[PDB]
Curated annotation (Swiss-Prot):
This is Large ribosomal subunit protein uL6c. One of its GO terms (biological process) is translation. It comes from Spinacia oleracea (Spinach). GO terms for cellular component: chloroplast; ribonucleoprotein complex; ribosome. Component of the chloroplast ribosome (chloro-ribosome), a dedicated translation machinery responsible for the synthesis of chloroplast genome-encoded proteins, including proteins of the transcription and translation machinery and components of the photosynthetic apparatus. The keyword Metal-binding does not apply. It is found in: Plastid, Chloroplast. Belongs to the universal ribosomal protein uL6 family. Keywords: Chloroplast, Plastid, Ribonucleoprotein, Ribosomal protein, RNA-binding, rRNA-binding, Transit peptide. One of its GO terms (molecular function) is structural constituent of ribosome. Component of the chloroplast large ribosomal subunit (LSU). Mature 70S chloroplast ribosomes of higher plants consist of a small (30S) and a large (50S) subunit. The 30S small subunit contains 1 molecule of ribosomal RNA (16S rRNA) and 24 different proteins. The 50S large subunit contains 3 rRNA molecules (23S, 5S and 4.5S rRNA) and 33 different proteins. The lineage of its organism: Eukaryota, Viridiplantae, Streptophyta, Embryophyta, Tracheophyta.
Length: 172
RNA sequence: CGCUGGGUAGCCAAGUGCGGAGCGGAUAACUGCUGAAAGCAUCUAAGUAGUAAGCCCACCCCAAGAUGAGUGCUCUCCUA
C-alpha cells in the first residue's frame, strides 16, 4: 500500500545515506532511517522508497516511512493545524504573552508553555487552534490540553477535538 | 535517709524545640500522540509523551579490612 511521495513543493531535500534533511519555505526537519529501508532522489519529481530483503519487519516498515515522509514535506510546505472546542460555562482561553492560560473549573488557572516551534491562536473566548509543522509535537500538544479536563458524558463539558463523537448519557 | 516538709547541678518526661522536603530520574496499571502489516482502523513489533503513599537518587548517621585497602595538605628519615 505504498505511493510515491509528491515533492514539487518548492522544498529542498538532502541526505547522507542514513539520514534525510528537508528545508523549505517555513521550517526545517530531519529524520534517520534504519538499515531496512532506503530512499533515493528520483529526478522525475516524486520519491520512492525501496526496502531490504523481504521479511516481516520490512513489510510493516515499508508503508511506515511512506506516511512520515509524506507528512515530513506537507508539514514543511503548509504545516498542520489542529482544532479544539471548549464546552462549559466559565471555561475560557487566552494567550498572555508567549504561553497560554486556561480556566477549566480548577481553583487555579493552569499555565503551560508554548514552544517556539508551534503557533497558537484563538478566535472566540471558547475555542483554540494549534498550528505547527510536525504532527508529533502538534498532536501531542493538543492532547495535553485535552487531558486537563476531558469531555464528560453527562453534559459534554470539557475540551474536545473537531469531527469526533461524545458518548452521552442521562444523569437523572 | 528514724519519720516527714522543700531542693541546685545531674538524669528524666508529663516539659521544651525540630523533623518528614523535591515542577528530581526511570516505571507499573491506565489514558495518549504519530502511524504500518491490513489503501480503512489500531497507544507500537520504529519512535514518543503524561502519571502512583510504590522503585532509584536527593535528606540523616556510619563508612577505604572497599585486601578493589583510595584521594589531598603537612611532617620526619640523625651519628660514625
Ligand atoms: Mg521532692
Ligand atoms: Mg525528701
Ligand atoms: Mg490515533
Ligand atoms: Mg493511517
Ligand atoms: Mg515499541
Ligand atoms: Mg512518588
Amino acid at each position: 500500500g505504498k505511493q510515491p511521495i509528491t515533492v514539487p513543493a518548492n522544498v529542498a531535500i538532502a541526505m547522507e545515506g542514513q539520514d534525510l534533511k528537508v528545508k523549505g519555505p517555513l521550517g526545517e526537519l530531519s529524520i534517520t532511517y534504519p538499515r531496512e529501508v532506503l530512499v533515493e532522489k528520483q529526478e522525475s519529481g516524486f520519491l520512492r522508497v525501496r526496502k531490504a530483503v523481504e521479511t516481516r519487519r520490512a513489510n510493516q516498515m515499508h508503508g511506515l516511512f511512506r506516511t512520515l515522509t509524506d507528512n515530513m514535506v506537507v508539514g514543511v510546505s503548509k504545516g498542520f493545524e489542529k482544532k479544539l472546542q471548549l464546552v462549559g460555562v466559565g471555561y475560557r482561553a487566552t494567550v498572555e504573552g508567549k504561553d497560554l492560560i486556561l480556566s477549566l473549573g480548577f481553583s487555579h488557572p493552569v499555565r503551560m508553555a508554548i514552544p517556539d516551534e508551534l503557533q497558537v491562536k484563538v478566535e472566540e473566548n471558547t475555542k483554540v487552534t494549534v498550528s505547527g509543522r510536525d504532527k508529533s509535537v502538534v498532536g501531542q500538544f493538543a492532547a495535553t490540553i485535552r487531558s486537563w479536563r476531558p469531555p464528560e458524558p453527562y453534559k459534554g463539558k470539557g475540551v474536545r477535538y473537531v469531527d469526533e463523537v461524545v458518548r452521552r448519557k442521562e444523569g437523572k
